[PDB]
């Protein structure tokens, strides 16, 4: 099953 999708949008590439 899925582990835990976390919101971490690294805006700065």
UniProtKB/Swiss-Prot annotation:
According to UniProt, the name of this protein is Cathelicidin-4
Q: What is the role of this chain?
A: Potent microbicidal activity; active against S.aureus and E.coli.
Q: In which tissues is it expressed?
A: Large granules of neutrophils.
Which modifications occur after translation, per UniProt?
Elastase might be responsible for its maturation.
Q: Which family does it belong to?
A: Belongs to the cathelicidin family.
Localisation: Secreted
- The chain residues annotated with the modification Arginine amide are 13
